Amino acid sequence: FHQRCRLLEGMKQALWLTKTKLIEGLPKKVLSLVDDPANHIENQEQRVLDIISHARLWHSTEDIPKRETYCPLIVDSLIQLCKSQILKHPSLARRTSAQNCTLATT
Amino acid sequence: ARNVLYPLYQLGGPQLRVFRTNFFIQLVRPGTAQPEDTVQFRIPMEMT
Amino acid sequence: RARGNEYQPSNIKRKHKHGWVRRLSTPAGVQVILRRMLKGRKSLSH
Amino acid sequence: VARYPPIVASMTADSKAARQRRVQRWQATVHAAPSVDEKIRILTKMQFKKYVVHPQISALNADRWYQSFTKTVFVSGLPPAPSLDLAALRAAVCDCILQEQVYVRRRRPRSLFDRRQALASSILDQVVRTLVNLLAPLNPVLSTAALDCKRSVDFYWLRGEERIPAGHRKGHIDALRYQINDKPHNQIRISKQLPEFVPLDYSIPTEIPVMKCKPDKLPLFRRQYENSIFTGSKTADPCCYGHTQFHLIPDRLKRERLIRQNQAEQVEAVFRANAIASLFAWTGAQAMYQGFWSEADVTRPFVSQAVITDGKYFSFFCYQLNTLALTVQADQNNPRKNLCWGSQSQPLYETVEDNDVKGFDDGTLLQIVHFLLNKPR
RNA sequence: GAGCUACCUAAAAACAAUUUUAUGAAUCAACUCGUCUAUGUGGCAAAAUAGUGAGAAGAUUUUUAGGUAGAGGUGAAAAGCCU
RNA sequence: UCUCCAGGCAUACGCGUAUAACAACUCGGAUAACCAUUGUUAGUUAAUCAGAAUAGGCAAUAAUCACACUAUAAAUCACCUAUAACUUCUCUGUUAACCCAACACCGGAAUGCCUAAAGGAAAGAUCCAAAAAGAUAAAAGGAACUCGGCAAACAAGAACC
Ligand SMILES: [Mg+2]
Ligand SMILES: [Mg+2]
Ligand SMILES: [Mg+2]
Ligand SMILES: [Mg+2]
Ligand SMILES: [Mg+2]
Ligand SMILES: [Mg+2]
Ligand SMILES: [Mg+2]
Ligand SMILES: [Mg+2]
Ligand SMILES: [Mg+2]
Ligand SMILES: [Mg+2]
Ligand SMILES: [Mg+2]
Ligand SMILES: [Mg+2]
Ligand SMILES: [Mg+2]
Ligand SMILES: [Mg+2]
Ligand SMILES: [Mg+2]
Ligand SMILES: [Mg+2]
Ligand SMILES: [Mg+2]
Ligand SMILES: [Mg+2]
Ligand SMILES: [Mg+2]
Ligand SMILES: [Mg+2]
Ligand SMILES: [Mg+2]
Ligand SMILES: [Mg+2]
Ligand SMILES: [Mg+2]
Structure with a gap:
């Protein structure tokens, strides 16, 4: 199974292959994290909107950017926005990121 | 060298050495204005 | 309309329609070349 | 009580003075445009032949030529003139070099010639991202800043004039147009x-x-x-x-x-x-x-400011723009000139042997940190 | 001999503004065509000019390369077109 | 400097030195000036502009700001598995007022940007005839013109075979 494979049966086939059970919704622990007001970023809504506008319109010189450019850009901007929380939480310095990394199992 | 065959090179071949040179060049006055370092030459059409 | 401008130059068309490789492709074309060689033409083909 | 007409050239005549007045007529439209977009649109809508200036170019002595095109003075050195755990930054930066060079597993480039170049890009992206992250607490502005990867920076300007040497326009005076289209690795x-x-x-x-x-x-x-x-x-x-x-x-x-x-x-x-x-x-x-x-x-x-690296050696530059009045009309009486400061390239590390970087220089890392710690007043 | 023209194949391109039941619809440019008149008639031109007109998101127009050849080809048949 | 006109700059295809300077004043430009002409000498500079390893496995899901939508004419290598190789800049295009029309032809000629900041000059001098061509204006009348309201009009509306 590689990137371009498109399972005909969708998740049901993927659940069978990996021997996993599906629960709708994210874990309650994860959900409760952002309900806390302290996690809320300063000017969160405006910065996210600016990220969307920059990803889709401002970043390029062209009238209408293409998905092969803004799709990577929107995610990279979001991670940087979330990565700014190191001011509140010094622990976030113990994680790092790599790109285009190969994963494999048998 | 011009007007001669070069030995065809294949992986692992020797270096191509031209012991006597067939290329003749002449230094020419620039028609236009050139930087002081630049020098103009007229060279045979087969010279790289 | 005004006539006389039927030549619309294109080097790709010219060499493909009347060139050396085109003439040698068929025996009739080779005989064309032989005739021009016997006359002494400076230009055997385009 | 005599109202003499002003002594100005004709608007429509075929003369140099008349043309210059028509130039001012167009320029007044720029002065009267409220939005910055209209000013740029008016200033750039007419396309003519322009020299394409490459920031990275193999031409000899291109730096001196670029100064003339820009009216820039280059001064060797740095512009005249907070504990941050230099050890912690050194550890993180060393990890960045090791991660891409020694640890990550990826499908190698097909080219076989881009492998060295791709490696240099990977580490510089890592070094920039981590430093802009680690240094954010000391300088809060970096938290709200935008990090760009290989984005386009463009400038178009006129400087100087030439007489057209040939053709139907022989003898006409035309301004020398330059454009810089640049894609900095990071900004x-x-x-x-x-x-x-x-x-x-x-x-x-x-x-x-x-x-x-x-x-x-x-x-x-x-x-x-x-x-x-x-x-x-x-x-x-x-x-x-x-x-x-x-x-x-x-x-x-x-x-x-x-x-x-x-x-x-x-x-x-x-x-x-x-x-x-x-x-x-x-x-x-x-x-x-x-x-x-x-x-x-x-x-x-x-x-x-910019830091320019070949992947191992680093050089640091500071630029101050004082003049956009580079045209013949605007530069006739201008005492101002643009300033650039630069330092000699110095290595940031020597080699990666075993799983430890050898030859890492703290001094170069400080310059990168000092540049990133610059803040608005 | 299909660099013109007829038809076809492949790869491409262009179509503003204004209205509309939303389209081989309407108004009208660019663009394509060529209704009527005058000029021109060894002319600017071996078919043009100047006006006036027709279509103008389509069976539209246009570009590049290829194809079909005279006992033939192509033809929304004018016995029209194939330098 | 003034008066006036309003398709210009690039690329493609094509053309092949018509490019630029000097010197000439025979020929060429349908005349001069000046050169598009003759002779000599020069020119167009690119790793970004432009041109020029192998064997297998495999794909239901348009475009139109692609979201909502609607539609019908049904509409563009990658990725993976193995094998092999394990550091490179040479070559070619680049000038011009240019091409197809026997001509320095009121013609034909694709795309991008822009509409005057770019590009240009309708008058060699004089005269104010007829005829001829084009433009504007018209007392009273208003199709009486003519094969026909052709052409023109301060009109450009209606209707029927
Ligand atoms: Mg002919
Ligand atoms: Mg054609
Ligand atoms: Mg054809
Ligand atoms: Mg339209
Ligand atoms: Mg219609
Ligand atoms: Mg109509
Ligand atoms: Mg109609
Ligand atoms: Mg037909
Ligand atoms: Mg019939
Ligand atoms: Mg008949
Ligand atoms: Mg002379
Ligand atoms: Mg003469
Ligand atoms: Mg000349
Ligand atoms: Mg000459
Ligand atoms: Mg040129
Ligand atoms: Mg003719
Ligand atoms: Mg002008
Ligand atoms: Mg006269
Ligand atoms: Mg009248
Ligand atoms: Mg009257
Ligand atoms: Mg009557
Ligand atoms: Mg009568
Ligand atoms: Mg009439």
Whole structure:
């Protein structure tokens, strides 16, 4: 199974292959994290909107950017926005990121 | 060298050495204005 | 309309329609070349 | 009580004085445009042949040529003039080098020639991202800044004139058009301008180089296409200023190749040309985003800095823009000139042996940190 | 001999503004065509000019390369077109 | 400097030195000036502009700001598995007022940007005839013109075979 494979049966086939059970919704622990007001970023809504506008319109010189450019850009901007929380939480310095990394199992 | 065959090179071949040179060049006055370092030459059409 | 401008130059068309490789492709074309060689033409083909 | 008509040239006549008045008529439309977008649109809508200036270029002595095209003075050194656990940064930066060079597993490039170049890109992206993250607590502005990867920075300007030498337009006077289209490896844009490095109207005895020949003799070629003034983002973006630019020298221009080509002296010149061209394009584009152009020169010096690396060695540059009045009409009486500061390239580390980086220099890391710690006042 | 023209194949391109039941619809440019008149008639031109007109998101127009050849080809048949 | 006109700059295809300077004043430009002519000498500079390893496995899901939608004419290598190789800049295009029309032809000629900041000059001098061509204005009348309201009009509306 590689990137371009498109399972005909969708998740049901993927659940069978990996021997996993599906629960709708994210874990309650994860959900409760952002309900806390302290996690809320300063000017969160405006910065996210600016990220969307920059990803889709401002970043390029062209009238209408293409998905092969803004799709990577929107995610990279979001991670940087979330990565700014190191001011509140010094622990976030113990994680790092790599790109285009190969994963494999048998 | 011009007007001669070069030995065809294949992986692992020797270096191509031209012991006597067939290329003749002449230094020419620039028609236009050139930087002081630049020098103009007229060279045979087969010279790289 | 005004006539006389039927030549619309294109080097790709010219060499493909009347060139050396085109003439040698068929025996009739080779005989064309032989005739021009016997006359002494400076230009055997385009 | 005699109302004599003003002594001005005809608007419609076929003369030089009449044409100049028609030039002012067009320029007045720019002065009267409220939006910054209209000013740029009016200033760039007409396309003509322009020299294409490459910040990274193999032409000999391109740095001196670039100064003339920009009216930039280059001063060797740094511009005249918080505990941050240097050990912690050293550990993180060393990890960045090891991660890409020794630890990550990826599908290697097919080319077999990009492998070295791709490796240099990977580490520089890692080094920039981590430092902008680790240094954010000390400098809060970096938290709100925008990090760009290989985004386009564009500047278009007129400087000088020439007489057309041939054709139906022989003898006509035409301005020399230049454009810089640049794609810095990384750049940081902030919403507040940095403090100036010297007062506007600052004067030094150093003289900008004068080139006897035309731009062509330095191998430079003209094309006609869209004129663009771009800072890396559109004018609507709040983050309209620049903080730092990171450039990676192409492998073609790296030290070992240059020595073999016998152009040893060009090792430093390659760095300087990239800094002068890239930073003038960025600061000039920032100034025009604020409404300043040749006929409305900047009231505030515009500042930006760049670190230029070949992947191992690093050089640091500071640029201050004082003049957008580079045209013949606007530069006739101008005492101002643009300033660039640069330092010799120094290695950041020597080699990676085993799983430990060897030869890491703290001094170079401080300069990167000091650049990233610059803040608006 | 299909660099013109007829038809076809492949790869491409262009179409503003204004209205509309939303389209081989309407108004009208660019663009394509060529209704009527005058001029021109060894002419600017071996078919044009100047006006006036027709279509103008389509069975539209246009570009590049290829194809079909005279006992033939092509033809929304004018026995029209194939330098 | 003035008066006036309003398709210009690039690329493609094509053309092949018509490019630029000097010197000439035979020929060429349908005349001069000046050169588009003759002779000599020069020119167009690119790693970014432009041109020029192998064997297997495999794909239901348009475009139109692609979201909502609607539609019908049904509409563009990659990725993976193995094998092999394990650091490179040479070559070619680049000038011009240019091409197809026997001509320095009121013709034909694709795309991008822009509409005057770019590009240009309708008058060799004089005269104010007829006829001829084009433009404007018209007392009273208003199709009486003519094969026909052709052409023109301060009109450009209606209707029927
Ligand atoms: Mg003919
Ligand atoms: Mg044709
Ligand atoms: Mg054909
Ligand atoms: Mg339309
Ligand atoms: Mg219609
Ligand atoms: Mg109509
Ligand atoms: Mg109609
Ligand atoms: Mg037909
Ligand atoms: Mg019939
Ligand atoms: Mg009949
Ligand atoms: Mg002379
Ligand atoms: Mg004569
Ligand atoms: Mg000439
Ligand atoms: Mg000559
Ligand atoms: Mg040219
Ligand atoms: Mg003719
Ligand atoms: Mg003009
Ligand atoms: Mg006259
Ligand atoms: Mg009248
Ligand atoms: Mg009357
Ligand atoms: Mg009657
Ligand atoms: Mg009568
Ligand atoms: Mg009539």
